[PDB]
Design a protein around this ligand. Structure first.
Ligand SMILES: O=C1CCC[C@@H](C(=O)O)C1
Ligand SMILES: O=C1CCC[C@@H](C(=O)O)C1
Ligand SMILES: O=C1CCC[C@@H](C(=O)O)C1
Ligand SMILES: O=C1CCC[C@@H](C(=O)O)C1
Lengths: 158, 157
């Protein structure tokens, strides 16, 4: 049905999608301003870590400081194979994509890092309130020269 | 009210029920979960230590994997299930938790907990591809396997 309430939802979903698209195409020095797409109290970060706890970055200002670190450590990062998923909630989107670039973490040799990622984007008033990324930390270990633990799966059918 | 979109709403509703059934399947019912798939459907784990998926291809293989899984994860339950419809009536995502005993050959019995994203793509009202994404490090912990710690110097507070 074409009601003003359904129309508002569509508008919201369209606006929010544009921001997800912008986020995912943000490269290079533009990364230093990606925080501006967040609410003042917005949270972003990595939900799949070796420690098992997220690295959550809280607040628009913190996100901007994190961007300085990220550009140092991932100096040429690009996201590719981007698929955006709208949901039944006009303020919640998922993205499946890959990423590749140099990895330059102190205490390790410089490497080439590739991973598969899922991102969650939740919105409030047209700005991102919570962004979360999910990847396989094992692929990061490989990029850093870190031995990847191996699980034997005995009897796993063929 | 347009017949195309009526078809889509219907397919999406039907598909949502199958996703719910899958996510609520527990205990011996797990041995019949393969029935929710197309004959050539694929399921499995997309986040592995090896970097390659453990993909199980076909309804019969899927049914075999379930015997294995019931041995290895005898009491597994999904919880905190959130189902996400998408713009494709045939594609859904699920965010959830899962936990249970982990009973692998050659490792001490453990208690395994992880956070999961699942992808479900449909064809003809059955699952053509299921993929699950998790953090393998939590499965290492559960088996007593040492997990390296990545240092991130400079990482701001
Ligand atoms: O920018 C990111 C959040 C901090 C951890 C980083 C990582 O090690 O992948 C990614
Ligand atoms: O996980 C990540 C890979 C490297 C770039 C990071 C970022 O600053 O977004 C995210
Ligand atoms: O049922 C499953 C697919 C094969 C690997 C398993 C695991 O080791 O997590 C999960
Ligand atoms: O990753 C998994 C943990 C144990 C159950 C397996 C399943 O139910 O498919 C999946």
């Amino acid at each position: 049905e074409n009601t003003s309430e359904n129309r508002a939802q569509v508008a919201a979903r369209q606006h929010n999608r544009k921001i997800v698209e912008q986020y995912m195409h943000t490269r290079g020095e533009a990364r230093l301003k990606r925080h501006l797409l967040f609410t003042e109290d917005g949270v972003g970060g990595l939900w799949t870590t070796d420690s098992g706890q997220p690295i959550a970055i809280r607040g628009r200002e913190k996100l901007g400081e994190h961007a300085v670190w990220s550009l140092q450590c991932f100096p040429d990062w690009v996201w590719t194979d981007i698929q955006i998923f709208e949901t039944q909630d006009p303020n919640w989107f998922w993205v499946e994509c890959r990423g590749e670039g140099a990895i330059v973490f102190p205490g390790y040799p410089r490497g080439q890092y590739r991973n598969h990622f899922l991102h969650s984007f939740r919105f409030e008033n047209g700005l991102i309130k919570e962004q979360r990324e999910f990847m396989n930390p094992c692929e990061q270990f490989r990029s850093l020269g870190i031995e990847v633990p191996e699980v034997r799966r005995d009897g796993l059918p063929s």
